[PDB]
Symmetry: D3
Subunit: 304 residues, 6 copies
């Protein structure tokens, strides 16, 4: 089912010793749980340009060894691991648990090898397995999640974030851009000392006057695409109007401080729900392609 | 023609005495003058979530009696009155005057029963009849209109707003978000002491630094969908680029002060003009669904 | 090929002596290099309303003589020159050089006659020929370009902007809204004292707190449509997410200071790439129609 | 008695026909009610420079005729109301003296500017204007650390109570009592307190919307005691001189009916080693820009 | 010795049962360690007006019982700690005196407010609170131009070192040494220096997020010397009185454990011609709003 | 004559080879033209603390060799130009004295910092630099309440007229005359007046874009008289000390050619009860951060 994906992942050479005490490198793979079988996002992202908002450039490599560039050239090595699902191994459509353990292995592999995992696409359950993987290899390390979502997503006890909280696994969590808050959410937001920046807060209180995010701990970044306004990311199953611009998000992302990025999860993208140009290119693919690129930049250039 | 709609409306139980000196409740109906017969907005709005931007929840009821929830639970009772036009009573397509008197009755009924009327869909002529209805039952009460529109809409002497002004019916009017101002408009804006916030004013002067709207009088809120940027609400017959985000509008809405809301009119939505996702959901329906919800919130939580 | 266009352009009466020492008038034409043969933008713009953001009105005239309105009525005379390409002269599709010399003549003609040229549509090469034309008639005059683009567009030595720089033709250039900056770009940005406002700068540093653009020299305004966010102008071959709102651009445009506008170039629009409403109207056409109108306003009302 | 002062005022030539449909001119005099006989402020201002914050210049004249120039600012010096017996006027003597003086100057076409005093000049000058122009509506922009409407004797409270004002704006209050709030409610007065201004960020106050003729009243104690200590009953946490200068610039209206700068007590000032007081330096600046406003107010 | 002062404090009636689950009441006393025997501040504040910046009013009582009212603010005046032999107490005499006094007042249900001194009152008052409530966590909001943690003798450094604080916020520092930064690192203290505040724009500081009981400590030298010159070792480029007033308003928390206003030296003040000091006017204002905070703190 | 002062300056060891391609070092001296013989400022600053606003520290040396350290800030004290006969130097004596002194210190590799005076030090120091480095272009950032270019005798007007400057920035002007505007036009000088700064909101001034070597000139009267009253001809509505501190921080450039802090007159100051002047406290702070800028200027 995923075999082909995990096999080469296991055959990935660990990061070189030349990478002495410096951030990176970044391993990138496609994850498609809860989403239709056609997952263009990973493939779409790779064809997109390399130049970033900040003055640096991505370099994507299908194979190792990932050489460490001089701490000055501003290249950003990224290991393409391809799509987790092999769109050839029959028409088998993996289970929830089948997706979890598949993702769990990839992250456990890439982390032990020293790479910073960036899952792309999916329904956000990758956030769960990727975080549990990290605390498995680094039980001492504390983790804080900056979670971009229009939904606080902690009501359902099965929700990836709520689970992490329930299992006493997080040092803290920041909820950026919520605009659909329920009674259950408020209760959980109370019970768990959760810092949160709802939309009316962000927009009315400053916009530019965003004092960054003070984080002293390794950071996991998870971005539900519906955090963006439906006019920027319409390819979502649960859209809520009054969201972030792509620029809005790009800004807040840059202000995330911390020692290291434990991993990154960009999800919520459904191609059957997108808004397409006349050349059949979707708005949300254009939006999320940018965000993924700058997410990788944060993994390479995060600080405190 | 509308008969079926008005009949049950007449059979609506007045607000209970339990509602002692407190805001609400809210009655909601569909109005489709000047728009194609298929009016999904009302139906689309009802299927949308109940949780609001601010920490409260809507409750929609097809029937009375609308019990008053404890002044703490944060539920927001809404009486669904359904679509004014009965899409079954032949293919008769009502007249301008036929729409006016139909709307006029509904508002007169719901107001005497104590409900706050919220018209949804249409071309904005509901604003005219709903306001005249209020001043009919409350001739002593002064009224101020916060009017969201890309067009000042007071040039044509037949325009609902201009008529209200011409008939000496308003204590004042605020024009938010205009970006197509004609010579005739400026003349009328002069003649009638009209306060107004054009787009370049709003955007350049603050954005966040919006000192709210100081209103001492009962407020009618009318929102032409074209006040929003065509990228947020493309389903408009007269789009003008450079408008409000859904967030932009949501913000300014929250800063509307006053004793009570006399009524709310959300209009300008044309489904034949919308931009649709691949699952045939329109951008403007997603946008206006949010706005309607928060409009209802203002009726329940307005102050000075 | 273009003959029909240039012929009447040559037969255009020069601006009257009544236009004593005052800004304008404005000549407008359609330019389609690098774009599909169907170029609706010019035609779409003309059907759009006349009223501006600022309190003035456009007047479009197919023929002279362009009378000077009293310095108070706030009318803005615009000479429609029509589409450069005659969509009738066979299916001949002009060359790069064929487009350059065609454009070069039109600008040279209209400038000597006293008009301010505004090219509409195309791939931005009109910027090159229009500027060289101006310095041909006014070799003493210094020129500064305010360039709106998501790409700095100076890497390729053939690029219109880079060429102008390389040929020592500009007093200065301002690059507004870049978000894809390469190594080559940074080198050229260094070598040529180029002032520039990237997207993260604009958005994080102020937004409203934009101290205008201090220009002491005649200004050429060139606007690649991709400076706008793909949600506002998706009809671009190279979209980059995280761009300007139409409002964003409108704002920054207003803050352009200078003695006179040497010319205006609005380009980057590809109808085969647009996002269309259900009535087959494209988002980018709605956006750029507004921008073109306000661009004309700047030519008539620029100052220092 | 003031005797000599009124003589000069009564003998003042009316504004020229060249002045038709132009703002101004400005009549300036010294008023010392509630303050010690030594009132240096008028003299100190006159000694102060002529160039303004905005790019224009004052021109001061002890006598007419005040000709109208094409970017200069003509000012008629009318001198000190009280002349040097040892007469110490009563409240009514100061009132009727000011009321008469202002009534003259208004008819002459000038814009009256009272300097010094305890703020009672505001009462007589507004009453003077509304006596001559009952058709005109009047709005007062009042700069003060105190709402100054508790005491029924207060010039403002009186003006409000006699149904004489279309509205009042209270800028920079930071000592509001229960009684103050009561009066603020019934007379429906807009007000921008100190905690408000600073929290709202001072810069994003472009202006104050106004369509009626404006009277400007500035209790010196609106400024922080570190900028204007020469005040009876000072309240800390006030405006910088720039803060006030800024907010003044944003005052809109057709015309200025008059200006009253008061609250200055030299026996309470903080003096440099050369015996120049901080408050005299501050208020000298403020007065100059008030005059500029009289010449350049608009909507 | 203080003798008489403690007598009154020990004989203070505890808070009424009407006060149950309401913030307050407030106990107020004068503390003069490190300062000359002439300590006018307490008396000066008491003479100052009662109306606050926010719309409420103080009510001062020399004796109980302090009844709980439905928008008034009850304040218990406990008077000057030192009574007029020529006894000049030692550091330990001031410490044990304050420590005892505060321990009493806390048990009585009152919120202690020390006035005057050198900031050593902060030490004893926090220690008093944590002595009675070891379960309670404590966070200190510290206004000072100096981080004041270099000297191991400093009240703050001691409090931190004894593992007594959940956290500390240092607002308005503008003289930070290498040693200061070292201590700031290991004890993980949040701090908002002067260059930060102004560059971040003062207005967009809505509040400071806090869930634990708060002690407020205000070294007077945090204000610019032009607002509070009566300080030993002044540092220019500080807060306006409004600036401080603003930042104070944004202090969040369940309850105020106590307040210490210090750094005031009358021999160093700048005086008006009527011998009233600038710093007394400034700090009199600040003290009033601190009391309002004790009554209206929340989250 | 200055005699002794120049002796020390001429005998100053040049900057070490360790200093190669590093900003600094800094030479500091006292200059007293146009001011009374009692010039406490230099001594007062030297007595003031060493820690800066930004996290670094000054180290002051009366003599060399000034070794280059890996976050300390070496400062060479050159002392008072005038030594205690009763000689009172002429304009030319102060000019040629300063011009010679600065020419030496520049060749030694040091960055000259004049302290005190009437602003004529700006003239000689710039002339000194352009005498040694005609290839270098120079831009002056000038802090002043007066554009100070009306008088053809003014140091700035002279510098401009002799075609010696690539550009000039005038920050904080609030008294602009017709003649000033004329000179501002022809010499094309950028300027940020007071009404501009405050209306533009002070916080959103990240920096000033500049690619040429910078001379920093600070007339003390740019600050509000409530912060710096010790100035001849004060103008109200100026910068807070923080305001100036902030704007200074945003000065960009490759190197600082020199710094001139002037306008301080102790006979005009406002003194605390212990006879310490407000302006000495303010300007002592400002001088320290100027030195930090010399060490940390960039683009
Ligand atoms: Mn979501
Ligand atoms: Mn409209
Ligand atoms: Mn481009
Ligand atoms: Mn007062
Ligand atoms: Mn201190
Ligand atoms: Mn000066």
């Amino acid at each position: 089912m995923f075999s082909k994906f995990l096999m080469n992942v296991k055959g990935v050479t660990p990061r070189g010793s030349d990478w002495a005490n410096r951030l990176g490198p970044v391993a990138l793979f496609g994850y498609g749980a809860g989403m239709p079988r056609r997952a263009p996002l990973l493939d779409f992202f790779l064809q997109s340009p390399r130049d970033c908002d900040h003055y640096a450039e991505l370099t994507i490599h299908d194979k190792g060894p990932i050489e460490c560039p001089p701490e000055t050239v501003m290249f950003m090595p990224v290991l393409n691991c391809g799509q987790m699902l092999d769109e050839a191994a029959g028409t088998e459509t993996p289970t929830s648990d089948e997706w979890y353990l598949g993702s769990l292995e990839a992250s456990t592999e890439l982390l032990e090898k020293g790479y910073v995992p960036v899952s792309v696409g999916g329904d956000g359950s990758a956030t769960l397995s990727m975080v549990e993987a990290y605390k498995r290899l680094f039980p001492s390390d504390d983790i804080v999640i900056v979670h971009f979502d229009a939904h606080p997503s902690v009501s359902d006890p099965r929700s990836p974030l709520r689970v992490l909280l329930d299992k006493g696994l997080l040092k803290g969590v920041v909820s950026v851009g919520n605009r659909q808050v329920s009674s259950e959410d408020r209760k959980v937001r109370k019970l768990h000392k959760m810092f949160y920046m709802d939309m009316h807060a962000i927009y009315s209180k400053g916009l530019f006057c965003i004092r960054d995010i003070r984080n002293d701990y390794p950071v996991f970044i998870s971005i539900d695409a519906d955090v963006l306004d439906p006019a920027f990311a319409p390819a979502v199953d649960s859209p809520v109007a009054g969201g972030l611009s792509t620029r809005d998000l790009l800004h807040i992302m840059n202000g995330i401080r911390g020692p290291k990025v434990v991993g990154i999860d960009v999800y919520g993208y459904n191609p059957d729900l997108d808004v397409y140009r006349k050349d059949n290119v979707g708005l949300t693919a254009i939006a999320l392609s940018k965000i993924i690129k700058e997410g990788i930049l944060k993994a390479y250039s995060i600080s405190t």
